[PDB]
Design an enzyme around this catalytic site. Sequence first.
Site, PDB file in Angstrom:
ATOM      1  CG  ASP A  21      29.245  62.369 -63.510  1.00 20.27           C
ATOM      2  OD1 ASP A  21      28.908  62.828 -64.662  1.00 20.27           O
ATOM      3  OD2 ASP A  21      28.947  60.969 -62.780  1.00 20.27           O
TER       4      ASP A  21
ATOM      5  CG  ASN B  48      26.704  64.555 -67.651  1.00 17.12           C
ATOM      6  OD1 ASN B  48      27.224  64.102 -66.860  1.00 17.12           O
ATOM      7  ND2 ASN B  48      26.663  64.639 -68.962  1.00 17.12           N
TER       8      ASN B  48
ATOM      9  CG  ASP C 194      14.891  33.385 -58.591  1.00 17.75           C
ATOM     10  OD1 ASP C 194      13.748  33.318 -58.825  1.00 17.75           O
ATOM     11  OD2 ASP C 194      15.367  34.213 -58.028  1.00 17.75           O
TER      12      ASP C 194
ATOM     13  CG  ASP D 174      30.454  66.828 -65.415  1.00 18.51           C
ATOM     14  OD1 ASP D 174      29.848  65.879 -66.097  1.00 18.51           O
ATOM     15  OD2 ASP D 174      29.998  67.473 -64.352  1.00 18.51           O
TER      16      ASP D 174
ATOM     17  CG  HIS E  17      11.618  34.372 -54.963  1.00 15.94           C
ATOM     18  ND1 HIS E  17      11.933  35.564 -54.409  1.00 15.94           N
ATOM     19  CD2 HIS E  17      12.232  34.048 -56.174  1.00 15.94           C
ATOM     20  CE1 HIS E  17      12.393  36.147 -55.330  1.00 15.94           C
ATOM     21  NE2 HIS E  17      12.760  35.524 -56.281  1.00 15.94           N
TER      22      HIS E  17
ATOM     23  CB  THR F 195      16.069  37.501 -63.263  1.00 11.83           C
ATOM     24  OG1 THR F 195      15.771  37.189 -61.935  1.00 11.83           O
ATOM     25  CG2 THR F 195      16.342  36.672 -64.403  1.00 11.83           C
TER      26      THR F 195
ATOM     27  CG  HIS G 277      16.996  38.361 -55.785  1.00  9.87           C
ATOM     28  ND1 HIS G 277      16.780  39.120 -57.117  1.00  9.87           N
ATOM     29  CD2 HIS G 277      15.696  37.152 -56.057  1.00  9.87           C
ATOM     30  CE1 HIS G 277      15.942  38.359 -57.889  1.00  9.87           C
ATOM     31  NE2 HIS G 277      15.519  37.416 -57.395  1.00  9.87           N
TER      32      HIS G 277
ATOM     33  CG  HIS H 145      19.939  37.449 -58.535  1.00 10.48           C
ATOM     34  ND1 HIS H 145      19.235  36.595 -57.415  1.00 10.48           N
ATOM     35  CD2 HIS H 145      19.155  37.787 -59.704  1.00 10.48           C
ATOM     36  CE1 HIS H 145      18.310  36.444 -58.242  1.00 10.48           C
ATOM     37  NE2 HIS H 145      18.225  36.879 -59.735  1.00 10.48           N
TER      38      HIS H 145
HETATM   39 CA   LIG Z   1      17.170  35.950 -61.234  1.00 10.31          CA
HETATM   40 CA   LIG Z   2      29.541  63.730 -66.513  1.00  9.16          CA
HETATM   41 ZN   LIG Z   3      14.141  35.757 -58.040  1.00  9.03          ZN
END
Ligand SMILES: [Ca+2]
Ligand SMILES: [Ca+2]
Ligand SMILES: [Zn+2]
Length: 805
Positions: A683, A685, A261, A691, A265, A159, A420, A309
């Site tokens: 990449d 880092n 939501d 980079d 759940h 969330t 989720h 979501h």
């Molecule tokens: Ca949520």
């Molecule tokens: Ca980088």
């Molecule tokens: Zn939830």
Amino acid sequence: WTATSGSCKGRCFELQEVGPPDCRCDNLCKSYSSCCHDFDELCLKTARGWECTKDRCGEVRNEENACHCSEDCLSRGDCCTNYQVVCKGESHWVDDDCEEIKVPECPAGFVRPPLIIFSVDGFRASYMKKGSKVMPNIEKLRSCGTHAPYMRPVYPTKTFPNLYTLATGLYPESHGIVGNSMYDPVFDASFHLRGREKFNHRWWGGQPLWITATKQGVRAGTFFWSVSIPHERRILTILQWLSLPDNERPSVYAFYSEQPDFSGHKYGPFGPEMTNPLREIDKTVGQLMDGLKQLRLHRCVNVIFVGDHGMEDVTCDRTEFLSNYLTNVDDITLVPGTLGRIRAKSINNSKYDPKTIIAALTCKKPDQHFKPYMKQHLPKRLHYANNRRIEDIHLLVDRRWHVARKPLDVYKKCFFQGDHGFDNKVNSMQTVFVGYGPTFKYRTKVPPFENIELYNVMCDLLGLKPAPNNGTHGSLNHLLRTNTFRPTMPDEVSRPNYPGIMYLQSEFDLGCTCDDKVENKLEELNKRLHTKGSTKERHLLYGRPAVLYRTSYDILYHTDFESGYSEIFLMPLWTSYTISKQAEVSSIPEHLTNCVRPDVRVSPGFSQNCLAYKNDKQMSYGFLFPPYLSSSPEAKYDAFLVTNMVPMYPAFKRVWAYFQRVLVKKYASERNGVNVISGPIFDYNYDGLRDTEDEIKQYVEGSSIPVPTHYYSIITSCLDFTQPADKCDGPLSVSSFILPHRPDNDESCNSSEDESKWVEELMKMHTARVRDIEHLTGLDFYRKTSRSYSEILTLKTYLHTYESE
Ligand SMILES: [Ca+2]
Ligand SMILES: [Ca+2]
Ligand SMILES: [Zn+2]
Ligand SMILES: *[C@@H]1O[C@H](CO)[C@@H](O[C@@H]2O[C@H](CO)[C@@H](O[C@@H]3O[C@H](CO[C@H]4O[C@H](CO)[C@@H](O)[C@H](O[C@H]5O[C@H](CO)[C@@H](O)[C@H](O)[C@@H]5O[C@H]5O[C@H](CO)[C@@H](O)[C@H](O)[C@@H]5O)[C@@H]4O)[C@@H](O)[C@H](O[C@H]4O[C@H](CO)[C@@H](O)[C@H](O)[C@@H]4O[C@H]4O[C@H](CO)[C@@H](O)[C@H](O)[C@@H]4O)[C@@H]3O)[C@H](O)[C@H]2NC(C)=O)[C@H](O)[C@H]1NC(C)=O
Ligand SMILES: O=C(Cn1cnc2ccc(N3CCN(C[C@H]4CCOC4)CC3)cc2c1=O)NCc1ccc(Cl)c(Cl)c1
Ligand SMILES: [Cl-]
Ligand code: NA
Ligand code: NA
């Protein structure tokens, strides 16, 4: 401390929050336990409920009532939302036919159409179709407005990360809300859904839409609501704010629903108990729209109906326990559930080793329902690594499963049936987008898109300049009737050199050999033409990529491929080639197996050398343009140029060889030709950004040849696959990947088997947007097409997901 003996009289749902210890009357005072003593009495009235009835019509105003049906209620802005329907013979908004809203039809004093964001927690994308019979108001929004079949959330599909991504346009790694629970080692502090630490501004980075608005002189409070304020009162509050005088009235509003939501759940995404929460959310939408219709705003306001979501079936019995894998389970802290995050329990424990934890969690059980990763090895599409709050060790959990530390965690907290948090490409995690109003299109379906894109659009809807963010401004222009943002292509920063033949073979001392000393005025001019660019229109279909940083590089042409060769990195930044449906695959001839050939256009000083690879016992090499797809035995020699070579671990070469020998040809047969651009990514880092040379952590031993962290390919063809990739008149279709360049295939548990059983599955996991590759390389692709730039931006944000219907 709060001096709660102040009063909310005339201050109910005030927009400016007042400073401690003065008591508060704003929509968040309940969360802080700081409301004035009379807040419930004055601001949370409930008498006589939320609806007018016949007997209330024209009643004498009673200030005790939750909402009003007295004749003065419209001038007061506080009628029950169904007032005009019950008392004035009007129709509910949902019962009116829809009529295109060609222009805003706004009351006088309205400077711009207001924006209302209606956020629904856990609203899974398939609810739009599966629940359509019980959500008529939402169905009207969806069918009359602009909608996507689904909207992709960010990872993790929790969330707080997603709502704050909606508000900021930023990945969680950048805005800082990287989960619902977090530990920040610099602050040495913890963030939780429950509690007050989350109220501290230091957790929340970027610039959310309400701050962007305020700074630019558009009024807007925060989008947060105290959980105990009922939904009916939230709607009435929004409608009251919309009745304020012009100088006081906000231009942006947010409603939030904890449903579906909350119930999801408990009951699972499609539990029979889920019908009622869906009906109830629809009723709330109906109230708002009826309320807007009373205010004569229903053809003035832009409304966004958006989820954070989805929701998946998950039960306690589908839990993997780390105590079944690890001996030292008490030496770790696990953030559990639909994703795992692991760190040392004690920073004073110096026997803690991430290497040993990962190995103990890798392919240990035949049907293991999670996979461990160092964060930098997670698929780049998740953009989940560049933050100190993200633990080095991550567990990607299979859909439908949980991970926990020990069994006692799960029964000393089966309650739940839904959850989720999983990989944001999983179908059950997808959520919803509908836009309705004068600025949105009429009865228009748009392709699925990512929630990081919406901040830009919300800024466009409000005439605001977006703060810097991860959306690609313009990629959602197709959602809008007006207020489009007309971006320009970025300027190329480095122009290429075009070298001719400048070196003799004997100037090279690279330690390479090739059996190529086998010797025609007809065909001689021909190969010169190829080296000058004669076949470039075939292999470079969308123009050469632009280099958006300062560097030294060469364009190299060949019969079968074109490349942009970096004198700094000693390898191509990109290699482009087209493979028609009719192309034939051939083998590397025996005499050419170890052939590498100096490139007489490129100085020895700017070339790789074979001796480095001979000496580096860990490191081998591969080619960007595959010798397997050469157009003829003679063109094949170009594939062995030292300028087409790249360093590859033997374990990676298994992946790469199968992609080049088997899969390119398969895509070309399926898609009617493909154009491929491949190259290295560095990449080190893990910030998702190209980079510089001074950031490279690993070289081929003994040399200045930098070792890529990843290899990409962008595979483009005609959306209308009746046309061949190289003669396409209309829109394009693309899929891309960014494969991690790893010295083992521990990620693929079935890797001892034939590449046909595991390689494509790896590449699907590492699917990418062209935009992700752009960030990682400083290149800009598709610079020369016949398509509008906005359409090209949408194409660059496309992700091929490999999920079913
Ligand atoms: Ca949520
Ligand atoms: Ca980088
Ligand atoms: Zn939830
Ligand atoms: C997605 O979009 C976002 C937004 O556009 C992109 O992120 C930007 O990337 C830029 C490059 O990485 C980065 O620019 C840097 O800004 C530094 C100033 O930073 C502060 O100010 C900004 C602007 O208001 C603010 O937003 C920042 O907020 C971050 O930090 C706070 C915590 O302090 C958080 O609350 C917030 O969530 C956010 O955290 C995220 O970003 C930081 C990095 O800034 C990460 O560390 C976190 O993990 C997290 O992801 C800041 O408060 C500026 O100082 C930098 O300049 C250095 O580098 C330049 C290169 O030009 C160099 O020339 C300079 O010398 C300088 O180096 C000096 O410091 C070094 C480190 O101490 C030292 O080693 C050197 O020797 C020098 O002394 C830099 O220009 C920008 O801040 C972020 N913005 C945001 C909002 O994240 C992101 O890249 C996009 N992602 C993709 C994949 O495209
Ligand atoms: O509203 C809720 C639950 N809830 C309830 N009471 C709260 C009370 C206080 C705060 N603080 C957060 C930090 N704030 C600084 C802001 C301003 C600049 O930086 C972020 C100060 C206010 C939060 C809450 C809160 O979350 N859930 C839905 C929701 C809606 C929109 C979004 Cl973007 C999100 Cl992530 C969640
Ligand atoms: Cl209180
Ligand atoms: Na080697
Ligand atoms: Na393996």
